[PDB]
Design a protein around this ligand. Structure first.
Ligand SMILES: Nc1nc2c(ncn2[C@@H]2O[C@H](COP(=O)(O)OP(=O)(O)OP(=O)(O)O)[C@@H](O)[C@H]2O)c(=O)[nH]1
Ligand SMILES: Nc1nc2c(ncn2[C@@H]2O[C@H](COP(=O)(O)OP(=O)(O)OP(=O)(O)O)[C@@H](O)[C@H]2O)c(=O)[nH]1
Ligand SMILES: Nc1nc2c(ncn2[C@@H]2O[C@H](COP(=O)(O)OP(=O)(O)O)[C@@H](O)[C@H]2O)c(=O)[nH]1
Ligand SMILES: Nc1nc2c(ncn2[C@@H]2O[C@H](COP(=O)(O)OP(=O)(O)O)[C@@H](O)[C@H]2O)c(=O)[nH]1
Ligand SMILES: [Mg+2]
Ligand SMILES: [Mg+2]
Lengths: 430, 431, 23, 50, 430, 432
């Protein structure tokens, strides 16, 4: 009908999808067993989007969990909704890539791609009308940043027309957890710009910044950061999954979000974030929802849109409001902050409304923004990559895998080509 | 699932392995018989009746240091075939331990490694422990790396090594063996963990307040270091870090695989419970020049890499707070081609405590693996010592009578000089 | 479709049991 | 008086797995299941029903 | 009416048939004593097909247990359904063949045949209209692969028009339990091509792959080996022994599945093989069977169907189902796989439906298929069989029985002709 | 039903006979009187009588009395007829000459009449288990003359041949190679299968594994009895794949001249070592292939295998048998001949091996017996030809053999008969 198959790669990707599959399961009134204990009829009308039927009142997530190290699935299997999943989709290796991109891309990936390609062929063909696939990974690992790219390269030539989204995690320069982090990312994002309909840029450090100030948790775990990220991907698809006052979906956004095919990187936002003391004294109205929405501190990307020009902005809202009160807040922000919006597109903001609020909250919103500030992310990687690459440091790890030295050169040129035309779009006269 | 095989060599090997398997059994709950009355698959293997055997092969050339274990409290814990002894030892002679006595037992130890490979299904690492002073622990170790490389070209082999102390020495002919072990530790290893006893003596006196330490006190710290390394493999964590991962984020060039470890906190029970203990303080203590177990100052050199391993009740927030605090310091220097030189691992379970030991029960701890250029000065001093020994041709006739051509001494000196020059090239900055 | 997965194997390797022991 | 080794008692009896002792009426009840919610969920129906 | 006689030759045939008779007894509600404890009249409806009548409301199987060794019949007689057989159906010699094909075919087995022809004629003349003969054996034995080949030779001359099948076990090179096994097989297939309407090539290796992977069994015993055959031959005749929505019998498949008299070799299939865990995540819907119907992992032979073209395909379904989806998934599979299927025969596949489900289940399917992959079975033998024959290895056990050297060349020649014609039909133009 | 008759010859056959017939008695539960206190699994070896007494199917024939008189004065004297303990007044005294033509001929008839009546007792006869040595004069010459009269009497009946091979280094005799060389004609044309084994390799394995540093002659024979019991275990008790003698007799012998496989049994370990050692199938098949566990002092790397016979026993599953054989075949160090990529005969049984009190092996639920026919045994006969030649040049100890009554010519012809056998194995090693 409208199905999305969820591909899960890497420990970052595996933990981000467990929390994700938790909240959507909560959204439909699904117990950890997998039956239905919800109340409203609407809680089960479009469960076919993410779930496949099973006997005895059962439903299963439409998931494919892949990780080159077998020691991560057991943590997932002992997790909250560990047994709701279909264990035939646990397709894993034995010897890990050790955060080496080429090992997961060339050496050890080639053995495990066929089995996961069978099981994505399993689920995609099982459904009737497939909207597209989704993939979750990080750009700092060896499997999600590595073999995960190979899956995209294969899946595009098989099914070209289906929408391809990845909630990729970009490594941060201020806090890094891998020395060869720029080497994999430079060789990874090159695959994204050629084969991906759209990619979402989420940085952990920006999640750390939000949890520091907006929420003020003394000890926020990696579940909380996942819980923030899990809100976004539920907020993107709530318009397609539930009836909305005005409806949209992934293709409605994606056609409206991407001016030229080389630019499909987005900064996500999610509006109602309040600390435990701030729930007491607030008035849940749509004006303050926009004020919290458009400040730069709520951003979970690592780039300030006050340093660039907003080319397009998307803001899908969840709950019942008046779109009138939605519409001037759209209009007012475009008029007041005229400089931050480009001139060759008037009406830079696109919105949608889904009637049903997120379950457990009254008002919420999600944000998809493509601004000129994303080129800040790319260039600060290049200052680290060229630092690595001038003295050929950490190069014997790659070259021993059998690939050539020119592949770094062709990737960086595509990076330098991309940011240059990205800069060129910034300085454009009407 | 993950598996690591310990191949303890020499008197240092057997004593360190005694320490290590002791604290491992108290970590997981294994009885001295080897049963759990009430994650273990990485270092113990199951039997039918519930027994669990350790994946270690203690091997030496003098039978006493292993027959003490044979009469020890863990006699029935270990499979007796895992205990391999020679009748006569090298008596601190590299040529003896590499070309006259070792070849008798090479076949036995390699067949044992075959048996452990048959027992294991997914093998992760070979952890070898030895010293650079003893003749057996140098030459026998060298030949076993040389053969084991061609038996398993791909498998990772971590090399815990005792480095001859800069001032104190238990032997006089030790620099020759230390010189000749370098070729093997260069061309037959993936990561090496040289450490001298003098700095651990200093740490134990200054911090843990034992005025007269023994070898057991040092070996307990080494076992704690190994436990901190392998805790990510043994149990879950927010960020589990495998051996392949932290061996990736430590080695810039094939010739440079010599990180320096560090552990914190290291303090007594009263001061431990009585001081507030936090991630910022333990991370600052990790970079103190007085807490390094290798007698060199990283302030004299430049860091190229830092592999960080927290343990216990630790939070990513204060992890990143500490990483920013450390980065904002002019005293700590970093090479130009590594603006991001950190890789942090998080583990849930706090380190355990061993009775008769020195550490207090502490809710959080930390290991550091810093790859810097400050270690090359120790090789420079040992080169000076080896030159002043070799000018007079002292003790050469022992190795010659054992049957070895003389020029490989100068060849190994040339190799060490080339390694030092490579370290100097890495130290050179392109500014 | 036609579901052809005769390929799903793990990894396991070890040398031969030929090496002499010297009785 | 004691035997040593690893005796692996059977994981399953493939008789019991693929052709269990479940009686035909019990099979019918299992197929009946939550049929109304199934028809709403994934359009799966029984034979000969509008 | 339409009666069936089950020949039982060799130890492999004996244990398989012993489990086989146990299966249908539960399907028809016959206790070990020999009486009827079922309830449905359909149980006693077509009971004469397999069993014969005795006084006291007792029914007796129509089988002929043949083995050169008297030890196997003690194990069979001590089995669970052990006393239901007739003691003089047990026709056994005193010495074995020693896995020597010429011994069973010529020297000792020719002493035991005359007692065997007595009993097989006895069960033949009791029934007024016998359907056909059924024999199970292994090609790697001495009695089943030896004297059994002689048994099918004579019975064909006596009864020309009645069908006969053989659920013969075909040897495998990666796990070979006999070194003269290619010698026994090469002299057994030459008997099979001349006088056999249909053959079901069962490989023991793939069944170990079946239980280890799909079923997840730690210790699969030889009883679990015999199940998956015992469920298979039960499924072939479940249209014969019970009324069906679309009827079939052994002859309906036989005329439809043999395009030319040389090709009668088939790889079986069974749809609902699922582990204990897999019943939790499963919908008992007929699209789910079709994948388990058409997956190559499902096959019981040692030939991947991807490397050859499907000639004629057959599918019998055991259970109550709408047959609009019988011929829908039918058409979907053929259209999508138009390249693999042969082109000179459009609509390659067969259907049959039995209303009565399997005992303990709602819905079962049995696959019988003729493809070009089966030619990979025999040429593997010829690569190995030619090895011993070139050096005359293991020849004195054969030559010492009083037999020549010509038949080794003739059996290979007849073999090498069959694959060549089989390959010729692989490379054919419509 | 299957039956087998024991023709133990020599002091070695008698001593092994005391060990082996003890082993089956505890296996089946026969009391030292010969009555079961509690189906017919004993029919292969035992025979019922009128008084319900179970009689072993064996003959203990020696040519010196004192070895057998110990059996006559032992605990299990009451388990035989006072006929087949056939003795002789004066022995051959380590002479093939005396035991073939002079002293053996006085009890040819009585030995051949005895084997006739046991064959008359049996209905379905499978084969004969004959035990002797290549060294002793009674064990070599007399065992030869009985055999060549057994070939005429029973052309088809299987004649498996257990014989003791003199060790490469240690020896209890100086004239034993003279007996050994002439006996090869008996084992080449007048046999179906050969189990040549030296005492020296059995000395090594018990010391290295079983902690038997001092092996007496009883310890070696206990290992011999277990190997024999493993061969006939398929006959005595049921299994998932029972393998009779003709089943494995066919599957070892590519050419009529090459019938000399190598025996190997596993696991052989003490209780002190098995406690810390988990036991399964995958490693014990590797135990059959170590050069240090071979019952014959030889290197498998020097030769290559043409046929291998697996005899698993106990709580075993065929799946890991297939898994184990997958690991063995995927190895370069294993070498197989070019004309046999499938060289394996697997035997599976239910009942585990039994353990005798006062023995050495621990009670282990699973075990495997290996019967490997390789060309690595080719060098084993090469050393005797060298040892024979340096006595043949000096004409030493020939007056003993010539005085008893053979022409000297047959000494030369037998040497060429061994020599022709060497080149026949060399053709096997050649790969086209
Ligand atoms: N840290 C530590 N070092 C040890 C220990 N035991 C021995 N060593 C070191 O090992 C060096 C000598 O080698 P040994 O370990 O005693 O014996 P070996 O390595 O087999 O060499 P040989 O003495 O020739 O047999 C000494 O210089 C010590 O520094 C120990 O328990 N702990
Ligand atoms: N393994 C083993 N070999 C034995 C045993 N007894 C004798 N032998 C072998 O038999 C050889 C000598 O032959 P014996 O069996 O002792 O005596 P014999 O066969 O009667 O021949 P004669 O001494 O001439 O009468 C010796 O070299 C031993 O190797 C035994 O109990 N175990
Ligand atoms: N947001 C988030 N990031 C995570 C989580 N777990 C791990 N990561 C990130 O993932 C990176 C390591 O990924 P890795 O496991 O090597 O990926 P793989 O090689 O594909 O398996 C680190 O930089 C972490 O920042 C999580 O729960 N949430
Ligand atoms: N599927 C199955 N195969 C068996 C069974 N018993 C034996 N076999 C196979 O039959 C072959 C040996 O057949 P064998 O007993 O020698 O047959 P015979 O000589 O005619 O009695 C072996 O390769 C086994 O794989 C059984 O119960 N089920
Ligand atoms: Mg020492
Ligand atoms: Mg004697």
């Amino acid at each position: 009908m409208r199905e999305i198959v969820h591909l899960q790669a890497g420990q970052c990707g595996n933990q981000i999808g467990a929390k994700f599959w938790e909240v959507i399961s909560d959204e439909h009134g699904i117990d950890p067993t997998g039956t239905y204990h919800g109340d409203s009829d609407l809680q089960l009308e479009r469960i076919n989007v993410y779930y496949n039927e099973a006997t005895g009142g059962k439903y299963v997530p439409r998931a494919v969990l892949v990780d080159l190290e077998p020691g991560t699935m057991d943590s997932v299997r002992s997790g909250p909704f560990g047994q709701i999943f279909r264990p035939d989709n646990f397709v894993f290796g034995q010897s890990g890539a050790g955060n080496n991109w080429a090992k997961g891309h060339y050496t050890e990936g080639a053995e495990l791609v066929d089995s996961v390609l069978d099981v994505v062929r399993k689920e995609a063909e099982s459904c009737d009308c497939l909207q597209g696939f989704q993939l979750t990974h990080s750009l700092g690992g060896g499997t999600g940043s590595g073999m995960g790219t190979l899956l995209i390269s294969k899946i595009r030539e098989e099914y070209p027309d289906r929408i391809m989204n990845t909630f990729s995690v970009v490594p941060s320069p201020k806090v890094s957890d891998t020395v060869v982090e720029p080497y994999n990312a430079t060789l990874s994002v090159h695959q994204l710009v050629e084969n991906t309909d759209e990619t979402y840029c989420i940085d952990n450090e920006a999640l750390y910044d939000i949890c520091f100030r907006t929420l003020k948790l003394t000890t926020p775990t990696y579940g909380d950061l996942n819980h923030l990220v899990s809100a976004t991907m539920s907020g993107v698809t709530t318009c397609l999954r539930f009836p909305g006052q005005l409806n949209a979906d992934l293709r409605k956004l994606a056609v409206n979000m991407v001016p030229f095919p080389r630019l499909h990187f987005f900064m996500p936002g999610f509006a109602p974030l309040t600390s435990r003391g701030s729930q007491q004294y607030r008035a849940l109205t749509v004006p303050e929802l926009t004020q919290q929405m458009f400040d730069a501190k709520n951003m979970m990307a690592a780039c300030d849109p006050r340093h660039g020009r907003y080319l397009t902005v998307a803001a899908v809202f969840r709950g019942r409001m008046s779109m009138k009160e939605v519409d001037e807040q759209m209009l007012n922000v475009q008029n007041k902050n005229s400089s931050y919006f480009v001139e060759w597109i008037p009406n830079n903001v696109k919105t949608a409304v889904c009637d049903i609020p997120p379950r457990g909250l009254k008002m919420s919103a999600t944000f998809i923004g493509n601004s000129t500030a994303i080129q800040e992310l790319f260039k600060r990687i290049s200052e680290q990559f060229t630092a690595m690459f001038r003295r050929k440091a950490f190069l014997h790890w790659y070259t021993g895998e059998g690939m050539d030295e020119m592949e770094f050169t062709e990737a960086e040129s595509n990076m330098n080509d991309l940011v240059s035309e990205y800069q060129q779009y910034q300085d454009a006269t009407a | 699932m993950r598996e690591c095989i310990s191949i303890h060599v020499g008197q240092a090997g057997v004593q360190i392995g005694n320490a290590c398997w002791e604290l491992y059994c108290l970590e997981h709950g294994i009885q001295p018989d080897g049963q759990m009355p009430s994650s273990f698959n990485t270092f113990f293997s199951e039997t039918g009746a519930g027994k669990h055997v350790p994946r270690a092969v203690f091997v030496d050339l003098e039978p006493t240091v292993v027959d003490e274990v044979r009469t020890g409290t863990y006699r029935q814990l270990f499979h007796p075939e895992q205990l391999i002894t020679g009748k006569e030892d090298a008596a601190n002679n590299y040529a003896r331990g590499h070309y006259t006595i070792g070849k008798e037992i090479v076949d036995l130890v390699l067949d044992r490694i075959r048996k452990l490979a048959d027992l294991c299904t997914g093998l992760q690492g070979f952890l070898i422990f030895h010293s650079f002073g003893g003749g057996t622990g140098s030459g026998f170790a060298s030949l076993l790396m040389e053969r084991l490389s061609v038996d398993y070209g791909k498998k990772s082999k971590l090399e815990f090594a005792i480095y001859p102390a800069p001032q104190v020495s238990t032997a006089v002919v030790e620099p020759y063996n230390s010189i000749l072990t370098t070729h093997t530790t260069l061309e037959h290893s993936d990561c090496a963990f040289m450490v001298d006893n003098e700095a651990i003596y200093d740490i134990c006196r200054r911090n843990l307040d034992i005025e007269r330490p023994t070898y057991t006190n040092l070996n307990r710290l080494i076992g704690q270091i190994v436990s901190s390394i392998t805790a990510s493999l043994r149990f879950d964590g927010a960020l589990n870090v495998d051996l392949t991962e932290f061996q990736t984020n430590l080695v810039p060039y094939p010739r440079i695989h010599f990180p320096l470890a560090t552990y914190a906190p290291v303090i007594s029970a009263e001061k431990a419970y009585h001081e507030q203990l936090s991630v910022a303080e333990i991370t600052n203590a990790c970079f103190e020049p007085a807490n390094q177990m290798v007698k060199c100052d990283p302030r004299h050199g430049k860091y190229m890499a830092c592999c960080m391993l927290y343990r216990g009740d630790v939070v990513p927030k204060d992890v990143n707070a500490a990483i920013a605090t450390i980065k904002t310091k002019r005293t700590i220097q970093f090479v130009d081609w590594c603006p991001t030189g950190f890789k942090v691992g998080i583990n849930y379970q706090p380190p355990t405590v061993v009775p008769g030991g020195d550490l207090a029960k502490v809710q959080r701890a930390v290991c550091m693996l810093s790859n810097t250029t400050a270690i090359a000065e120790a090789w420079a001093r040992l080169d000076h010592k080896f030159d002043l020994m070799y000018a007079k041709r002292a003790f050469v006739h022992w190795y010659v009578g054992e049957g070895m051509e003389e020029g490989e001494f100068s060849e190994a000196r040339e190799d060490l000089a080339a390694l030092e020059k490579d370290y100097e090239e890495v130290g050179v900055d392109s500014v | 479709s036609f579901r052809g997965a005769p390929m799903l194997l793990a990894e396991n390797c070890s040398p031969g049991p030929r090496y002499s022991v010297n009785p | 008086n004691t035997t040593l080794g690893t005796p692996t008692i059977r994981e399953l009896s493939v008789r019991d797995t693929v052709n269990p002792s479940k009686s035909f009426e019990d099979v019918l009840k299992e197929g009946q299941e939550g049929h109304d919610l199934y028809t709403v969920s994934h359009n799966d129906y029984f034979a000969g029903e509008a």
